[PDB]
């Protein structure tokens, strides 16, 4: 269901990493498989060539945490008006306090030791259930 349309109509785009993370852009190809592209350092930008109807989303390249693009989940290049590119602003979301705590703990404890931490089993599961591009596509379909 979630896949780029093979439209063949060019669309120039600026990816702008207005986040503190290293950003990994992900193109959803014609069968819906997620295909990763070169990463952007924080505060940096790239003029790239994409196509109308093509699906993109964005992630932290190291932890796979999800980021937003123009205030939302998915980015689809539109028609270019007056020879001017489309701006794709990549930003941090307001993570819950729970999910932010989980990011920090994950970045301090090796996965083998999540089970030696003194917390309810319910949180051990939450830690091992780390962000993943496939899962989010299954969700976003529903």
């Amino acid at each position: 269901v979630l896949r780029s349309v093979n439209s063949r109509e060019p669309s120039q785009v600026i990816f702008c990493n207005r986040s503190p993370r290293v950003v990994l852009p992900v193109w959803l190809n014609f069968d819906g498989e997620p295909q990763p592209y070169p990463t952007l350092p924080p505060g940096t930008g790239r003029r790239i060539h994409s196509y109308r109807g093509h699906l993109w989303l964005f992630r932290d390249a190291g932890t796979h945490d999800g980021l937003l693009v123009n205030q939302t989940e998915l980015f689809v290049p539109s028609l270019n008006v007056d020879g001017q590119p489309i701006f794709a602003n990549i930003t941090l979301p307001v993570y819950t306090l729970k999910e932010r705590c989980l990011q920090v703990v994950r970045s301090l404890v090796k996965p083998e030791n999540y089970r030696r931490l003194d917390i309810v089993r319910s949180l051990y599961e939450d830690l091992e259930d780390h962000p993943n591009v496939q899962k989010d596509l299954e969700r976003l379909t529903q």
Partner: protein, 104 residues
């Protein structure tokens, strides 16, 4: 421009915000409405320095880029009982435990 604050006396802490252009006296009217003590029975401090009623919070060093939502600046509070003011006193927060072995 909004500045974000913790106003602190003894074991009391208030979270609120104010304009960079608002006055020390005006901040006391806020405290009055919350803790029920009028401005004349209040002293406010930046660290050890007593603040003048007519000065702005900007003049006194609370700016929109230092006094942030996720990391607000501290303003000290002291009350007067009868003739004389108490000395400024702010109870520290609790101390965290040692980092567990797995987090080292």
């Amino acid at each position: 421009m909004d500045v974000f604050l913790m106003i602190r006396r003894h074991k009391t802490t208030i979270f609120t915000d104010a304009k960079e252009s608002s006055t020390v006296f005006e901040l006391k009217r806020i405290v009055e409405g919350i803790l029920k003590r009028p401005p004349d029975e209040q002293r406010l401090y930046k660290d050890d320095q007593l603040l003048d009623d007519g000065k702005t919070l900007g003049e006194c060093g609370f700016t929109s880029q230092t006094a942030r939502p996720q990391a607000p600046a501290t303003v000290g509070l002291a009350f007067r009982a009868d003739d004389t003011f108490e000395a400024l006193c702010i109870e520290p927060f609790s101390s965290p435990p040692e980092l567990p072995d797995v987090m080292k």
